[PDB]
Design an enzyme around this catalytic site. Structure first.
Site, short mmCIF file in Angstrom:
data_model
loop_
_atom_site.label_atom_id
_atom_site.label_comp_id
_atom_site.label_asym_id
_atom_site.label_seq_id
_atom_site.Cartn_x
_atom_site.Cartn_y
_atom_site.Cartn_z
N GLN A 1 1.98 -9.40 -3.17
CA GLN A 1 3.30 -8.55 -3.22
C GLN A 1 3.03 -7.13 -3.31
O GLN A 1 3.85 -6.40 -2.47
CB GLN A 1 3.87 -9.12 -4.34
CG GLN A 1 5.30 -8.21 -4.81
CD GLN A 1 6.50 -8.37 -3.95
OE1 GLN A 1 6.57 -7.86 -2.77
NE2 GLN A 1 7.13 -9.47 -3.90
N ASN B 1 1.07 1.78 -12.52
CA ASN B 1 2.46 2.01 -12.23
C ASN B 1 2.94 3.05 -13.17
O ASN B 1 4.06 3.53 -13.04
CB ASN B 1 3.03 0.95 -12.30
CG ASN B 1 3.03 0.10 -10.82
OD1 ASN B 1 3.00 0.55 -9.72
ND2 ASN B 1 2.54 -1.20 -11.09
N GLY C 1 -1.91 -12.92 -9.31
CA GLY C 1 -2.59 -13.98 -9.05
C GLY C 1 -3.18 -14.01 -7.64
O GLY C 1 -4.50 -14.34 -7.36
N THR C 2 -2.48 -13.77 -6.38
CA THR C 2 -3.15 -13.74 -5.32
C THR C 2 -3.69 -12.51 -4.88
O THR C 2 -4.81 -12.38 -4.10
CB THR C 2 -2.01 -13.92 -4.07
OG1 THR C 2 -2.40 -13.88 -2.86
CG2 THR C 2 -0.81 -13.01 -4.37
N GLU D 1 2.91 -16.53 -0.49
CA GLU D 1 4.49 -16.90 -0.69
C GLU D 1 5.12 -16.24 0.97
O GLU D 1 4.80 -15.10 1.33
CB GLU D 1 5.21 -16.34 -1.71
CG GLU D 1 4.66 -14.76 -1.99
CD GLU D 1 5.09 -14.46 -3.37
OE1 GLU D 1 6.38 -15.14 -3.68
OE2 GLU D 1 4.77 -13.63 -4.16
N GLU E 1 -19.21 9.24 2.97
CA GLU E 1 -19.54 10.68 2.07
C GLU E 1 -18.84 10.18 0.78
O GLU E 1 -19.63 10.46 -0.28
CB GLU E 1 -18.78 12.07 2.48
CG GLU E 1 -19.07 12.46 4.00
CD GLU E 1 -20.54 12.61 4.08
OE1 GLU E 1 -21.42 12.51 3.27
OE2 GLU E 1 -20.92 12.54 5.46
N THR F 1 4.54 -6.25 -16.36
CA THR F 1 5.56 -7.03 -15.83
C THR F 1 4.87 -8.62 -16.11
O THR F 1 5.60 -9.50 -15.51
CB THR F 1 6.00 -6.76 -14.36
OG1 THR F 1 4.72 -6.67 -13.56
CG2 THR F 1 6.63 -5.52 -14.26
N1 LIG Z 1 2.96 0.28 -7.09
C1 LIG Z 1 3.44 -0.75 -6.90
N2 LIG Z 1 3.28 -1.93 -7.55
C2 LIG Z 1 3.92 -2.95 -7.52
C3 LIG Z 1 4.94 -3.12 -6.45
N3 LIG Z 1 5.32 -4.24 -6.46
C4 LIG Z 1 4.58 -5.11 -7.41
N4 LIG Z 1 3.90 -4.22 -8.22
C5 LIG Z 1 2.82 -4.50 -9.25
O1 LIG Z 1 2.23 -5.76 -9.10
C6 LIG Z 1 1.86 -6.39 -10.36
C7 LIG Z 1 1.63 -7.94 -9.94
O2 LIG Z 1 1.12 -8.26 -8.90
P1 LIG Z 1 1.90 -8.63 -7.57
O3 LIG Z 1 1.56 -8.14 -6.17
O4 LIG Z 1 3.51 -8.08 -7.74
O5 LIG Z 1 1.97 -10.22 -7.53
P2 LIG Z 1 0.89 -10.81 -6.69
O6 LIG Z 1 -0.43 -10.04 -6.74
O7 LIG Z 1 1.40 -10.98 -5.15
O8 LIG Z 1 0.73 -12.23 -7.14
P3 LIG Z 1 1.89 -13.60 -6.73
O9 LIG Z 1 3.02 -12.95 -7.50
O10 LIG Z 1 1.51 -14.76 -7.50
O11 LIG Z 1 2.10 -13.36 -5.28
C8 LIG Z 1 2.98 -6.01 -10.94
O12 LIG Z 1 2.58 -5.93 -12.51
C9 LIG Z 1 3.46 -4.71 -10.67
O13 LIG Z 1 3.20 -3.72 -11.38
C10 LIG Z 1 5.21 -2.02 -5.90
O14 LIG Z 1 5.93 -2.13 -4.88
N5 LIG Z 1 4.42 -0.90 -5.93
MG LIG Z 2 3.10 -11.90 -5.78
#
Ligand SMILES: Nc1nc2c(ncn2[C@@H]2O[C@H](COP(=O)(O)OP(=O)(O)OP(=O)(O)O)[C@@H](O)[C@H]2O)c(=O)[nH]1
Ligand SMILES: [Mg+2]
Ligand SMILES: Nc1nc2c(ncn2[C@@H]2O[C@H](COP(=O)(O)OP(=O)(O)OP(=O)(O)O)[C@@H](O)[C@H]2O)c(=O)[nH]1
Ligand SMILES: Nc1nc2c(ncn2[C@@H]2O[C@H](COP(=O)(O)OP(=O)(O)O)[C@@H](O)[C@H]2O)c(=O)[nH]1
Ligand SMILES: [Mg+2]
EC number: 3.6.5.-
Lengths: 51, 427, 146, 426, 221, 427, 49
Positions: free
Chosen positions: F10, F196, F134-135, F61, F244, F169
């Site tokens: 995500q 973040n 997770g992913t 997803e 580098e 989160t």
């Molecule tokens: N900098 C930034 N961080 C994000 C953003 N969206 C989600 N996150 C961070 O990503 C963390 C969780 O990882 P995610 O990528 O959202 O979830 P995932 O890795 O895709 O795992 P799944 O939800 O099971 O698909 C959250 O705690 C957020 O802090 C974004 O748009 N920008």
């Molecule tokens: Mg995700």
């Protein structure tokens, strides 16, 4: 020429309405005999003649 | 240099509906017979301006043939190059080969005979039939037998549709497959295998049409045929005749069974994102997922390959592209042939039917290859033959038609020899 | 450098596929007449001329008459872009001709002379599609296309 | 892609579930005829999660109604949006369990469940990627729990690799409708704690307090309570039907809320809930939605959350919001109310933002709190059970049905140690 | 893109997503004096997430039409006049000063409600509209005689992940393929261009509304 | 000199949505893909008047990928690159790394392959993922594993987003971090840290944004990416390539975790008043209130620092600016490192985004340093991972997938080994 | 549902016996003539109704 979809090939085993009432005429002309018949033909008198 | 093609069966004369659809537009021939040098190989000009195809359509069932007679291609085919019986063979090889076969085939070959008449430089024949049908097996293996006693020396290019391994359409397929294969061997010089599952694969993997139909299959078969015949029609930098297959692809008089592969199979929208180069369209033709016959070309070893090219292709990179192919260990050649490539290059880019699932591309490649993994196909089909045989299943349809038990035993023993060959030659 | 490291040649040159896509099967056909009677044998003769809008190449097909004294040869000039000029040839490299040097569709004016490799063909007709194309794209009048 | 099949058991569920489809239909813009009449395109990218296109723009809900009396089956089709369900899915007996857990789970389930498993099996295999099941039932009635319970256990063996949500209202002594409630709930609960993955606790007692204190409704009929519950169920699965900044599908929730396998009883809530009088007077930003969220009076269970500690907690926000503004809120609450949160689990709050707020609203929220105050709702029931069962009162309608004296002693035993291990973690 | 085009486009987006814009605007002026800076004006729209939907050229046009020089050398944009139109979309504020005026339930100009049910667009050349009706007439006749379903075949090219997907729409080459290969009947290029121009999407001019096309080429009843 | 960029999860592919939105403007490429030679390292010039990026967005997803398919960059990408599963990992490391990753990574890297050979001067990779999920962490690690065994020596720059101390989160994220770093510790080469929460502070202080959503955070992350990589697309006065970083910033084969920062984070209004110059944006890069990672660097000592400059910067003054920094005694370097800077100067100024929030500055600095403070981050994560683990909380999900207690007890000691190697190297 | 559980079919549709009782043997008889002479054989012919 007669190239419309309504006319059919000489080697056409498919059914044509009213080909059992024709003779001495080639098939494409025979398909013309049914659609636009001549006053002498039987297909003309079975359709457009007054009883 | 002219070539005549005979389309036999339900399948054979449906691909011919898609083959002859491409030729008429590739040479700019309107679907009625005239235009608004290069067609000399397919369409014989006649009279004022009207071109007529060099091809015959014979099938004992009068259903599909007269559809053509009332389809969109009415004025194109002649009234009499469309032969039609009164009833079919009904998946019974013996029924097609003796009872009805005798009554129509002499009318057939005595029509081809006046097809070679107007022709002057007849290159060869090339047939289309489904070895699993009643007419494809019967009326082909009867005509193929009768042609070889009239001409004999001319080559014969078979495009036969085999029964898929697990996918099937009729129940008595493994009977009509072996009875024809017994007659395919001694008459067809070069036989190109075609599947129906492997092509249902390609429509789903590349053109990603999830639920494809026949008209999707026949269209991209009409490509491979036009791709391997383009050398006669157009001019190229390095062209290969239709007799090359009778000398570059057949090492032994009985090892004549070829795999086919075509690339690039790409829809319209994935086209312009992808980088169309000779490096990968030469690569694409070698993955097992890009063949027209369901078999793994990895299990065996390639005896000989011939690569046809089309369109804007410089002869430099085709060398460096196949040069890498030899250096991949994932594929292996047979030591009885250290050099086994035949490159043919032509100038005409692949024409796309209007409204097709393929995109306009600058180039294309068709790969016709002999191998030994085909020796697995005649085995896996052989296995299922004996099962129905020990029970004499469906047999009384055969003997009741006129044939007998011997050719059931010996055609099993004929293909039996064929297994030893693809085993022994692969050693 | 990219060529030596492995890179598609058509990409190296560029701007090829774009024209092919828009004009895949667009061919301007002209009917030329080559007058030659002033030489010490032979006569004048008609030919045709194909201008492929896809590649801006030229192809001169010779038409044949029944019982002519000429051996049948389908083509009279290979499908390559016309030079239109004299270029100092190099013995090693066959000349690379740029589009500006070569002929363009705007050059045929239906009454002009075409210096095709010294031969001066006088083109004198055109097909309906060619006339329409000229009116559409080059703003020609109806009378010029006559 | 991801799909949910929805099963409704007994009278309590069918009527709630009826509101659930009138609601979700409008969130996607389809009329009671079953044809699309919405405006945004984003309504139709994910209707497969809840609907199937039938023919020419007709969408049918993926639901299976079921009960043991044809009474509700008539009423459910009476009102609007009754003409959308597939009639084939209307499996239902004829006799009537009669508020008897043993009759629903041993007698009528014996002869009807084999038929509802049929249509469940059909709906489940007809889709491609099952996300889970969505059961709307009760816990006091006979055909609600006992009949709905057996259907659950028949499934967990069939699809042991899927989620299972069961929104089940519970009985309270202030809303004491039947007389055998303590016999039914305790009998039912013993089976949810084994098979169901997680259930949302509801009760009609708290839903009335909401309808008086904050909604200030004078006479709240069952049409409004079921309309409130329909919103919460319609919010939990917003991350499936609509794109969001921080997506969180059903399974992403469970693994975040259930620390130990036997602790999966949640309390819920919803914001903003405002009378149509004070609606035009109040502010609608993110901190408002939070103070109204963690308001102990907003929970839809008769369990005072400030009498226990939150193991975890979740909050699904909907609408265009600033993810900082969302998150630093959840931080403040956890720093201020430091005692009400567990010590050995840091950052007990998960947040999620979805980009499509409910119909009409610019911004909403949804609370799901896995607290340890939910233990009392089992304590008040465990004693009503043991008060009746001490004299075996009302028992001969179960013993004379297939149950023995062992099971009641076993159900109270399991229910007992369950409460023991909430007090344990506190 | 002109001002009215950009304006109704933004109105459509804000009404269909129900996005609260005032939050992202208020924090950029602490004083409630209106007249937010131009950068912050564009910033708040980026926060709300409107950047994905409208083009930067369109956001640029909106800024220049609401920009106002508070001073000879200072320029700002009065967000109050802009927020006024943005709630004129939803409702009519200050209804208490005027009870006699009637407000509509939803803005009718922004919404179609039938874009999947009917083709609202009209061709301005009458002979072009004549031809497009003629071709659908012929096609509806053929479909009714043969008994072919239409929408079932387009579901394939739409559902897949390997196409640039948009609900109720297939791009032109996939449309043509389903038109001639999957269905029997044959249609030429001029009529395909007419069929495309009528059901074409104005947001993204390369998507074809197959749902509306099927609904008009055979009614479900 | 090309580089491919994959985005996982995500957070990853959402950040990438802001990176490509940025690149298309840095080279005048419209979203539909046609310009009206620097692009070569990101976009392969395909067809004619087209450019397709070297990028593959993948996840489990569909919701966040099929959003791009319908976004405004529909036509930019190649619809084969955007991979998408069916069921999410659900913040369950074991679920995306042992259950769902086992089916999707084979489709992943077999696509990375035919992006690699399409390149010519491949420098390395650069991957994006948030280790809390997770992913992004689970199969993000699994994917990195098979890249290392396949290429080995291509520099892999992992731009991760770590969980913040306070703002978070997820509740299971401390598990997913420890498990993730167990692999990233030894596979990647140059792993950049980002919180973040620390970025939230930047927007409030310097950008005076009081409500910044993710759309902003992902926007000013792209600037850091677009800066350190601009040394390839625009020939600078003092170049620095991807390799580098690999040898200037990694003093020991395990300490690769770089604090990043950037300056100036200026608004369009304050851009007028502030007299931008080099001697102060250099100071602005080192003040602990400007690094994207939540830690106090004054608590540790810099291992080594690196300084990317862009725009109108002459190298006389960066020598002067770096000089004064080494004269200031509030920031101190490790005794193992007397020479402690990797200066870098480019020519093309930063690019602005219409609708963005950063101004058009004449110059900018992107500092990527390496401190001994980053131990505290791992010292912090290890504690709150140990708290939940003592109760075996949430474990029965990871174990319940098919994993075991082994992977937890043995990853816990790895961070113990790592932290022990920070207080050691800090001596 | 009643039809499955057993119920007189005529009672399901209803309103049948009422007409049968009032009009049990009431039959309106007409003399029609069918002209057909305009076809290629045969003639016109009287019928009843
Ligand atoms: N900098 C930034 N961080 C994000 C953003 N969206 C989600 N996150 C961070 O990503 C963390 C969780 O990882 P995610 O990528 O959202 O979830 P995932 O890795 O895709 O795992 P799944 O939800 O099971 O698909 C959250 O705690 C957020 O802090 C974004 O748009 N920008
Ligand atoms: Mg995700
Ligand atoms: N690929 C492809 N295969 C076809 C097509 N038409 C028929 N077939 C194949 O033909 C096989 C059945 O044999 P047929 O050719 O139909 O039967 P037949 O040879 O005409 O013999 P009879 O039916 O007795 O007249 C099926 O297994 C199909 O795979 C076609 O258009 N394309
Ligand atoms: N929230 C809500 N609860 C209801 C409604 N109708 C009945 N109930 C509750 O359901 C409980 C009894 O459940 P019941 O329907 O008898 O279960 P069943 O007989 O097994 O189907 C009563 O205590 C009611 O409070 C309704 O419309 N809404
Ligand atoms: Mg047949």
């Amino acid at each position: 020429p007669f190239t419309e979809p309504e006319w059919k090939i000489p080697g056409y085993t498919g059914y044509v309405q009213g080909l059992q009432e024709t003779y001495k005429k080639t098939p494409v002309m025979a398909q013309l005999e049914t659609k636009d018949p001549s006053p002498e033909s039987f297909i003309y008198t079975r359709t457009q003649t007054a009883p | 240099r002219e070539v005549i093609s005979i389309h036999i069966g339900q399948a054979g004369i449906q691909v011919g509906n898609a083959c002859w659809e491409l030729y008429c537009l590739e040479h700019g021939i309107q679907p009625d017979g005239q235009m608004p040098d290069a067609f000399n190989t397919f369409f014989s000009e006649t009279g004022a301006g009207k071109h007529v195809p060099r091809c015959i359509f014979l099938d004992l069932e009068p259903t599909v043939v007269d559809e053509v007679r009332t389809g969109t291609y009415r004025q194109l085919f002649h009234p009499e190059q469309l032969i039609s019986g009164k009833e079919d063979a009904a998946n019974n090889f013996a029924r097609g080969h003796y009872t009805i076969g005798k009554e129509i085939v002499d009318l057939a070959l005595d029509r081809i005979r006046k097809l070679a008449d107007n022709c002057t430089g007849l290159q060869g024949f090339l047939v289309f039939n489904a070895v699993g049908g009643g007419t494809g097996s019967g009326l082909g293996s009867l005509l193929l037998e009768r042609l070889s006693v009239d001409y004999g020396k001319k080559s014969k290019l078979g495009f036969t549709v085999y029964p898929s391994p697990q996918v099937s359409t009729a129940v008595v397929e493994p009977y009509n497959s072996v009875l024809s294969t017994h007659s395919l061997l001694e008459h067809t010089d070069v036989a190109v295998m075609l599947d129906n599952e492997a092509i249902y694969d390609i429509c789903r993997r590349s053109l990603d049409i999830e639920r494809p139909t026949y008209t999707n299959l026949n269209r991209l078969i009409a490509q491979v045929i036009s791709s391997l015949t383009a050398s006669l029609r157009f001019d190229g930098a390095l062209n290969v005749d239709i007799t090359e297959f009778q000398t570059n692809l057949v090492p032994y008089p009985r090892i004549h069974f070829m795999l086919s592969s075509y690339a690039p199979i790409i829809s319209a929208e994935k086209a312009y994102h992808e980088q169309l180069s000779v490096a990968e369209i030469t690569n694409a033709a070698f993955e097992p997922a890009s063949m027209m016959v369901k078999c793994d070309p990895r299990h065996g070893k390639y005896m000989a390959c011939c690569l046809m090219y089309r369109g804007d292709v410089v002869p430099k990179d085709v060398n460096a592209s196949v040069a890498t192919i030899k250096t991949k260990r994932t594929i292996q050649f047979v030591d009885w042939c250290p050099t086994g490539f035949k490159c043919g290059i032509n100038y005409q880019p692949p024409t796309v039917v209007p409204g097709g699932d393929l995109a306009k591309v600058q180039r294309a490649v068709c790969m016709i290859s002999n191998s030994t993994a085909i020796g697995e196909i005649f085995s896996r089909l052989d296995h299922k033959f004996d099962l129905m045989y020990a029970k004499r299943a469906f047999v009384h349809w055969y003997v009741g038609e006129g044939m007998e038990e011997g050719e059931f035993s010996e055609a099993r023993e004929d293909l039996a020899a064929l297994e030893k060959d693809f085993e022994e030659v692969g050693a | 450098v990219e060529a030596r490291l492995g890179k598609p040649s058509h990409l190296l040159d560029g701007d090829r596929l774009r024209q092919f896509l828009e004009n895949n099967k667009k061919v301007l056909r002209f009917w030329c007449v080559w007058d030659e009677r002033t030489t010490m044998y032979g006569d004048r003769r008609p030919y045709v001329l194909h201008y492929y809008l896809e590649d801006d190449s030229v192809e001169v097909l010779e038409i044949n008459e029944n019982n002519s004294g000429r051996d049948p040869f389908p083509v009279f000039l290979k499908r390559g872009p016309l030079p239109k000029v004299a270029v100092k040839t190099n013995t090693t490299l066959n000349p690379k001709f740029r589009k500006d040097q070569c002929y363009n569709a705007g050059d045929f004016r239906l009454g002009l002379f075409i210096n095709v490799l010294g031969r001066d063909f006088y083109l004198h007709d055109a097909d309906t599609f060619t006339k329409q194309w000229y009116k559409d794209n080059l703003g020609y009048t109806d009378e010029e296309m006559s | 892609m991801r799909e949910i099949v929805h099963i409704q058991g007994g009278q309590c569920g069918n009527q709630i579930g009826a509101k659930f489809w009138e609601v979700v239909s409008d969130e996607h813009g389809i009329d009671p005829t079953g044809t699309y009449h919405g405006d945004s395109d984003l309504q139709l990218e994910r209707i497969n999660v809840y609907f199937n296109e039938a023919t020419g723009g007709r969408y049918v809900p993926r639901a299976i109604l079921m009960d043991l009396e044809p009474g509700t089956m008539d009423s459910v089709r009476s009102g609007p949006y009754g003409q959308i369900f597939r009639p084939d899915n209307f499996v239902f007996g004829q006799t009537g369990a009669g508020n008897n857990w043993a009759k629903g789970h041993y007698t009528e389930g014996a002869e009807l469940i084999d038929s509802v498993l049929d249509v469940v099996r059909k709906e489940a295999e007809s889709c491609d990627c099952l996300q889970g099941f969505q059961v709307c039932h009760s816990l006091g009635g006979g055909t609600g729990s006992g009949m709905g319970t057996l259907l659950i256990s028949k499934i967990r063996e069939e699809y042991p690799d899927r989620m299972m949500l069961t929104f089940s209202v519970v009985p309270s002594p202030k809303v004491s409708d039947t007389v055998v409630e303590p016999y039914n709930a305790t009998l039912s609960v013993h089976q949810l704690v084994e098979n169901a993955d997680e259930c949302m606790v509801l009760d009609n007692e708290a839903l009335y307090d909401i309808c008086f204190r904050t909604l200030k409704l004078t006479t709240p009929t069952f049409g409004d309570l079921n309309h409130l519950i329909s919103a919460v169920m319609s919010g939990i699965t917003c991350c499936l039907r609509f794109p969001g900044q921080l997506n969180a599908d059903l399974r992403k929730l469970a693994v975040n809320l259930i620390p130990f396998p036997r602790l999966h009883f949640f309390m819920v809530g919803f914001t903003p809930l405002t009378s149509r009088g004070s609606q035009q007077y109040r502010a609608l930003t993110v901190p408002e939605l939070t103070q109204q969220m963690w308001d102990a009076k907003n929970m839809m269970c008769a369990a005072d959350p400030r009498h226990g500690r939150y193991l975890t907690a979740s909050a699904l926000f909907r609408g265009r919001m600033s993810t900082k503004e969302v998150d630093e809120q959840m931080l403040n609450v956890q720093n201020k109310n430091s005692s009400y949160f567990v010590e050995w689990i840091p950052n007990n709050v998960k947040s999620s933002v979805c980009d499509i707020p409910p119909k009409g609203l610019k911004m909403s929220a949804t609370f799901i709190g896995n607290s340890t105050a939910i233990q009392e709702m089992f304590k008040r029931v465990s004693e009503q059970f043991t008060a009746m069962f001490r004299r075996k009162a009302f028992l001969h309608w179960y013993t004379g049905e297939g149950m023995d004296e062992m099971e009641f002693t076993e159900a109270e035993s399991n229910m007992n140690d369950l409460v023991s291990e909430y007090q344990q973690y506190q | 893109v002109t001002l009215e085009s950009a304006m109704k486009r933004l109105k459509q987006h804000v009404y269909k997503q129900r996005v609260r814009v005032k939050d992202f605007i208020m924090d950029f002026d602490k004083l409630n004096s209106g007249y937010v800076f131009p950068n912050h004006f564009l910033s708040a729209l980026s926060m709300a997430g409107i950047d994905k939907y409208l083009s930067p050229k369109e956001l640029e046009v909106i800024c220049e039409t609401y920009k106002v020089q508070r001073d000879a050398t200072l320029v700002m944009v009065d967000h109050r006049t802009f927020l006024h139109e943005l709630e004129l979309v939803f409702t009519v504020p200050h209804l208490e000063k005027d009870p006699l005026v009637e407000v509509a339930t939803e803005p009718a100009d922004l919404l179609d409600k039938t874009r999947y049910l009917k083709s609202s667009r009209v061709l301005q050349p009458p002979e072009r509209e004549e031809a497009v009706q003629a071709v659908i007439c012929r096609l509806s006749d053929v479909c009714y005689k043969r008994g072919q379903p239409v929408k079932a075949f387009f579901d394939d090219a739409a559902r897949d992940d390997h196409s640039a997907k948009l609900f109720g729409h297939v791009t032109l080459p996939q449309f043509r393929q389903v038109l001639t290969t999957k269905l029997d009947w044959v249609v030429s290029d001029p009529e395909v261009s007419l069929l495309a121009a009528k059901f074409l999407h104005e947001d993204k001019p390369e998507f074809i509304n197959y749902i509306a096309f099927s609904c008009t080429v055979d009614p479900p009843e």
